[PDB]
Write an enzyme that holds these catalytic residues in place. Structure first.
Site, PDB file in Angstrom:
ATOM      1  N   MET A 195       0.763  -1.254   0.000  1.00 24.56           N
ATOM      2  CA  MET A 195       0.000   0.000   0.000  1.00 24.56           C
ATOM      3  C   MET A 195       0.802   1.318   0.000  1.00 24.56           C
ATOM      4  O   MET A 195       0.227   2.404   0.001  1.00 24.56           O
ATOM      5  CB  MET A 195      -0.974  -0.012   1.181  1.00 24.56           C
ATOM      6  N   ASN A 251       1.658  -5.559 -10.314  1.00 25.86           N
ATOM      7  CA  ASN A 251       0.660  -5.355  -9.275  1.00 25.86           C
ATOM      8  C   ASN A 251      -0.679  -5.925  -9.751  1.00 25.86           C
ATOM      9  O   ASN A 251      -0.928  -6.049 -10.964  1.00 25.86           O
ATOM     10  CB  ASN A 251       0.508  -3.850  -9.004  1.00 25.86           C
ATOM     11  N   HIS A 272      -4.924  -5.378  -9.143  1.00 23.04           N
ATOM     12  CA  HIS A 272      -5.852  -4.378  -8.615  1.00 23.04           C
ATOM     13  C   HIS A 272      -7.284  -4.818  -8.873  1.00 23.04           C
ATOM     14  O   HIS A 272      -7.617  -5.182 -10.004  1.00 23.04           O
ATOM     15  CB  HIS A 272      -5.602  -3.005  -9.272  1.00 23.04           C
ATOM     16  N   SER A 277      -7.499  -6.397 -12.577  1.00 19.07           N
ATOM     17  CA  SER A 277      -6.473  -6.102 -13.572  1.00 19.07           C
ATOM     18  C   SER A 277      -5.081  -6.396 -13.017  1.00 19.07           C
ATOM     19  O   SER A 277      -4.796  -6.091 -11.856  1.00 19.07           O
ATOM     20  CB  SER A 277      -6.536  -4.623 -13.970  1.00 19.07           C
ATOM     21  N   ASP A 335       2.140   6.496 -10.867  1.00 17.57           N
ATOM     22  CA  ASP A 335       0.699   6.752 -10.811  1.00 17.57           C
ATOM     23  C   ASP A 335      -0.092   5.662 -10.082  1.00 17.57           C
ATOM     24  O   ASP A 335       0.075   4.465 -10.354  1.00 17.57           O
ATOM     25  CB  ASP A 335       0.132   6.970 -12.220  1.00 17.57           C
ATOM     26  N   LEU A 336      -0.955   6.095  -9.163  1.00 17.06           N
ATOM     27  CA  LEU A 336      -1.784   5.196  -8.356  1.00 17.06           C
ATOM     28  C   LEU A 336      -2.464   4.126  -9.209  1.00 17.06           C
ATOM     29  O   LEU A 336      -3.194   4.441 -10.157  1.00 17.06           O
ATOM     30  CB  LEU A 336      -2.843   5.990  -7.561  1.00 17.06           C
ATOM     31  N   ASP A 337      -2.214   2.864  -8.864  1.00 12.48           N
ATOM     32  CA  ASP A 337      -2.832   1.729  -9.546  1.00 12.48           C
ATOM     33  C   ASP A 337      -2.931   1.942 -11.064  1.00 12.48           C
ATOM     34  O   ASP A 337      -4.014   1.833 -11.641  1.00 12.48           O
ATOM     35  CB  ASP A 337      -4.216   1.460  -8.941  1.00 12.48           C
TER      36      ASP A 337
END
Ligand SMILES: [Cl-]
Length: 211
Positions: A90, A107, A109, A136, A142-144
């Protein structure tokens, strides 16, 4: 021969468990280490149960974000992983750190990116009246956000609630993360010029789709 990875977590680490299970069933991955930025992450216990070395790197115990990131990177690199895999990690990562791992860090998400970056995805999809939702897997930039590798979708129906969606999407996470890891282990993926390739062919911007 198993592709060596390091997994980064902050919490429960349910996706770490899915990978652990898939390996038991033959997935050609070796988890060399699990690293958490929180001492209270249950995922640390999941790893320990599987005899995987764990490292706690508490971000607040460092003078700055770059010091934290320096220790993180050195701890990761000690294991010479081929792939860095985020599982409920996080903390936002700085530009330099993301560059160091370009093409090698991914990652998962629980939304159909680019929609619903951030938290509470299931409730937000429901609130917006979406008819589809899912998960995904992407490269970290950039966030997620980042070039998509795989996206699995399902239907939202009238009886769904945020809890049914979270659980149904959790099933999709447990399916597709280990599957994507299998693609890397088999040398099927490349990241080049803002594009993802599978078996040498460009994927759609949305990544490989399921169903
Ligand atoms: Cl379906």
């Amino acid at each position: 021969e198993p592709l060596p990875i390091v997994v980064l977590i902050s919490g429960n680490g349910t996706n770490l468990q899915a990978i652990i299970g898939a390996i038991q069933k033959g997935l050609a991955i070796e988890i060399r280490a699990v690293i958490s930025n929180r001492a209270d992450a249950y995922g640390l216990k999941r790893a320990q149960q599987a005899d995987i070395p764990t490292h706690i790197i508490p971000h607040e115990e460092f003078p700055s974000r770059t010091d934290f990131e320096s220790t993180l990177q050195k701890t990761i690199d000690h294991y010479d992983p081929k792939l860095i895999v985020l599982a409920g990690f996080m903390r936002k990562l700085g530009k330099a750190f993301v560059s160091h791992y370009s093409g090698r860090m991914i990652n998962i998400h629980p939304s159909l990116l680019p929609k619903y970056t951030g938290l509470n995805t299931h409730e937000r999809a429901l609130a917006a009246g979406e008819t589809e939702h899912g998960v995904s897997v992407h490269y970290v930039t950039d966030l997620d956000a980042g070039p998509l590798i795989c996206q699995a979708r399902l239907s939202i129906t009238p009886q769904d609630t945020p809890e049914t969606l979270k659980t149904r999407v959790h099933a999709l996470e447990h399916i597709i993360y280990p599957e994507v890891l299998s693609w890397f282990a088999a040398g099927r993926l490349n990241y080049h010029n803002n594009q993802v390739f599978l078996d040498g062919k460009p994927l759609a911007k949305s990544g490989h789709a399921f169903p």
